[model samples]
Target: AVGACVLCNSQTSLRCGACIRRPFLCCKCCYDHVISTSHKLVLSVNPYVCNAPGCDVTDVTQLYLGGMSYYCKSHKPPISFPLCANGQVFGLYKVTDFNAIATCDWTNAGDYILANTCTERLKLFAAETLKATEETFKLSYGIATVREVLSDRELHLSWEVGKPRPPLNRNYVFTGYQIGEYTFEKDAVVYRGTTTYKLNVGDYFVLTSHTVMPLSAPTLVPQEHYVRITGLYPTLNISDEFSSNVANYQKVGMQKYSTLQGPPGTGKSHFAIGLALYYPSARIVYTACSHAAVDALCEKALKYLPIDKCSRIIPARARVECFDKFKVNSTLEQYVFCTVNALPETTADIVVFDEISMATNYDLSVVNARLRAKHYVYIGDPAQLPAPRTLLTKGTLEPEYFNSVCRLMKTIGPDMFLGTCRRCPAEIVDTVSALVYDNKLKAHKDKSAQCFKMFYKGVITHDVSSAINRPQIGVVREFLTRNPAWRKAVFISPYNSQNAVASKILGLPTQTVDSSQGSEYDYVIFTQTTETAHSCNVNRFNVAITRAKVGILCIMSDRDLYDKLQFTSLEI
Candidate 1:
């Protein structure tokens, strides 16, 4: 006896001369294969028919009522058969009748062959045949049952793959939506989401439809961020250097974990939010170093992601003015804000740590133990600020002891580095870039650039104790009064007393270097007191200059220290 057909693995009645790998095929399989269309085919003179009596419904009972046969309302044809893998027809078949036919009851020619004998063989053949030819066939995805539809039109569904598929990529279609295509790397978007959409158990394929999203700016791109549409889904491609990095980050997150390291003003915060939106069903914990940092991070998530999709975890004592619709909870529960120590024992889908430079390994470990997340993402500039307490003990190294340091030094692996500075002006960028990495500060090329203007006032004659330069303070007050917009500007100093006096003089909020690590403002009036050398550490200076997105007015009372800073000074 000859073996089964190579394609459908039914009885082999035809052989193809062109297909060396798969020489035999059933009628349907041979019709679909292009190679078999042109090839020399050897067909058996005798028709392949079962010796056993076929079912009455299978051979004689026609579905045609008027010349048109009725298709099943729930399931689509071709209807599966009882005996052969290739046994199917363009009409409905009752599940009970199928069982009856398989059992050799009156539904089929009774007791023609062994009852329920061909099921295992047919199912096994279907699996092996599909697995073998998936890559080469232009296969469409099998039916999927819709689970739920959120307000934002995010559809979660349980999907299945049948027959053949792609080697590297696959295409999908949703009714009332565009055609969606996907590759293996960005499989998370396709693979994730809830299992049930509406309320039906393995419902009919006719009951639901699908949608494909268009590549509009609003639909595909996040605000103020650039994302490239590589496939049906978009990949993070903000800048030349950052495009592939975000893809790599997604890859790592899909598999296990990844850390992101970048300079100040780079789009680290925006990138994290993109990922949160991508995996809508995944439970995420977005944490930062301080209260303000956490608040800002939560605000951004609410801005970009759907309200129902995001929740804020904050301190119980914290008062949030917004997020009326969001699910808020304490650390003892999910989506609540609470003290670090108060965080509850729970599991999360993803745990994201922002401003990680300020988080100690011990602090992070505590968070890790509590959340027990499946994926972890750490984002911070290791060069900006270290944790408040030094973790470097007698024998401890920087990378091993701290998370930021570990990522920075590539101790964990090569972390993503975002170089494009979007927040600060080019002048501020040049100055900070040099000071942090170049070991020397250079003057801004545009002497009249409004974004970064330096003023040097010689040793103040009307100075108070604790390095309050009264002369410079009065000058700043006049500028603030002349320009009401600058009244909201944050005045930064190294001493608390100067902050107090400056806050009083200009009627603007003030903060010291230590107190204002993670904060920033549009306009910053930095008053460098006499103890400038001691006050302006690399981290402090970095925080000061990068705060202003529009402009930074550096007022140095210590003229000698201004020279030490190598700033291009102008008269006030």
Candidate 2:
């Protein structure tokens, strides 16, 4: 099958990765062979499907995924890695570059081996000189070892091709294991180096993560510091009712487990600010998966607490400009702000997770393990944006909660839900209640006289199937022109390409639903560049609609898509 097509009996350099036979195909023959014959063609090394069965989504986090981030909350196309000799699978490893330097070009590129979360096949490639193999493939590092860990259940096991190491965390160097990298470049993303090895004891080898995520044990919480985080905590009585700054922290209940959930405009971040203000002596560590969410909380906290007292810990890994803005080179602060990954090795009395629904149980566990806190609260809207991947267990308290972590934390359910959205127009709130929250959230009418009334007949819809979005932009611009009362409107989309296009032509700021979460505008002009159905999702839809106090004008290329996207019986 090498450079040979079976059917046409011709010579060409094309092959099928989906099948074991690894049959080769030529250009014209490949067309009939793939299309007519139903053979799968794998254009290697892409994590996203352009026309993925549903929402054609991808990610910047997916360098290679998660930007303009196309992670659909409607259980996106789950990716599965390969199964190894020992069977259990996990990890994205490249044979040539154990230290991912580069490689996504045309030449000797398909060297990256993939073993993943819970599907596909785990392939180990080690050029040809060393050892083992796949379909005439199956590349291994001669003695490649891959240890595994699953996020959903409490399941982890050891697996390797050759000899195995002791069950110690050090044996596998699992602390901050660098499974893979996410950058668009040449083959240098991974380089074969010191990290490669066998149990040579005398000689030795060291293969590090291709995409090195700097993980350290410096933030490890002692076993003793972790209490039964779910149950009740001894109540602390402090009757200094927050007067001017309004620190009624007790309203949050003096219990160990707490949740602050509300739809958009509910002042969740404001509540976090008040919580920090009330707990004067409490060491609070506030965090979320998103830097935007953390930034929003930190900015609000800064209004009440001094910079020295309430420090925002920016990650060292962040870009120079981002880190330079708020350098926290201080002794200690009462309140700290940082992303989950950027968490410094510190202790806190109260740990607040800003958007719990947007993170998986696996992510929450990793962040939880590093902390030394007695009590914590998860603040989010489960009805809105979601976690990457998730699992359901039988015994968990809140199985209704999609978030695996929140499900286990029984106390973080409806009992903790915050009422009355403080930022949506009365008309918008009533429609959103029927659509998103199932008529649960109480309405707090828009305070502004200019509630973007002209376009607020509950919904404004547009289609770009023909004009390629020219009409969509024209309408949005016209809407802006008509509503001078609408200040600071943002152009948003579910796809990155749409935002890029809008930014270029409209000459305005743009953001994907993911990036616009922690910020709001007077108006949001939302559109998906292509007329693809998979482009919009309920979780993302909820975020887009609620981002503005005024209203949102949704532009899509499909009207059927528009009809389905309306999560409402109140659709006007």
Candidate 3:
């Protein structure tokens, strides 16, 4: 009976041959259907001859009561081979009485059929005749379709799932362009010649073999992820006895608001980087009161953190690009650095404010309002010089509530204190510790230690004292010459006028105590400019004395300078 093809619903010349309840199918549809499954398909037309050699039986099916093999019954070929539709032949052996009940020996035998057939169908794509292949193919979900086959090695396809649309314009431009290979995650969409395409999760195309194959599911295994501690100072170690306390400091830093106080050489900067390394995935915004502090902290971060993961912020007019003096240009414009005034516009998971005591109350308020983060970490010694009055607005002379670290401490108090001194020697730590913490000056037990001092008890006018201090300056030079390692020492003063005199005498850099708040040296010479106590800023005096790591020598004319205010005479 004339009917539509079962595989492709189209009325055509049909074949309804040897099947259990066979539906009529055209010759091409029957060929493709039988190739996919292990079903038997035979021609229904009547002039078929016996395929066996030397057999001329044409009407043997009618004589045998079946349209089966026309070979003589006694000469049945039991070990017949298969001629697969896609050209991969297989060995077939009869398993039952009928030749139709045969079994294939090849493992994954259908895999060969699909692979070879896909290539065959793709070849027709370039000829603009893929309708036949599209109607018959059913291997993958309808997520991809062959657009053009440039050669036996290259192809163009659209990964979008839909009825195939007309080809893109750019596809013709890169038809023969040689690319290394299609590399990406299994399910990632890749663009080639302006057309997007994606491979199925388990599919990969090998450019070397010019073939596509399904990948086997892989076994998953657990892996250990740990923080990598690197670029530490020669004397520092993450596994040290004090690391437990440092870990606790990091825990406190994760709160909504936290403050960490430490004297100089207490590993405060090291602890900050430790907190950074501990939270690898956290977006961090680290700011500081001075450019030098920011530079030092960023340099340490670059040593311990990935360069791409961290950035340094500088003023827009800053001449230097990096701490190491890299050139600034458009190529480096997209890096982690941002302008200083634009800081509040960005957001991060954690915001670290270094040397918080140097930030003005107004600037601190603005920065605190602009910073968007879950945790705020304020790190600095409040005993250091507070923000300069010059930074305050002209009319806003009175102190108000500010978001600075010192103001915060005065309100909420610090979470933890770094008591141990790692940077400074025991002598210097003992001296500054009593002055800053106990509000009195205490000398070293061994008075002849490197921290020994030379006090000037002379009474003279400002000009006379300035000249007399020059000869005493020779004493500091002789001490530093004996211990050349202490050459890193700087002469600091409360007034700029006196610092110039010391800078001229010592042949070394000298800075005001305010500018030297966040810096330290191996030794500090607190060269006094004026003898009056009213001119001395307690915070500035405290910061200058503590800047010494090994020793502090106060060259002053008045031993009882602030003795009435509780900073009594030196113990030694």
Q: Write model 3 residue lDDT over 1-572, tens digit each, in one string.
A: 55554444455433434443344555455545445555544444442334667866433222121234333344445643223333321111100111121222112323212221232211111111111222222232233444654543345554645543222211111211232223211012223422233323323232121122111111001112224322211223444533646555455443565677766667677776766555555666766755677677766676676766555655453432346532222222212333334464656556677776665433344455566555666777766655433112222211112223464455455666677666555555555666565522333333324555455543333432322245446656776677676677788766554554567667767766776776778677776555554235455666766676666666665455333222223332
Across 410-459, the per-residue lDDT of candidate 2 in tens digits comes to 33354355667877666556656766676887778743333331212222
Model 2 residue runs over 4 Å out of place are: 1-248, 251-254, 320-331, 387-402, 406-412, 447-468, 478-488, 528-533, 556-572
Best by TM-score: 2
Q: Clashes in candidate 1: how many?
A: 19
Quote the RMSD, in angstroms, for model 1.
26.9
What are the RMSD figures for all models against the true structure?
26.9, 20.9, 31.6
TM-score of model 1 vs. true structure? 0.49
* lDDT pick, better of 1 and 3: 1
Q: What is the lDDT of residue 208 in candidate 1?
A: 19
**RMSD to the native, candidate 3?**
31.6
Better of 1 and 2 by TM-score: 2
Full-model lDDT for every candidate: 0.48, 0.47, 0.46
lDDT of 2 at 121: 11
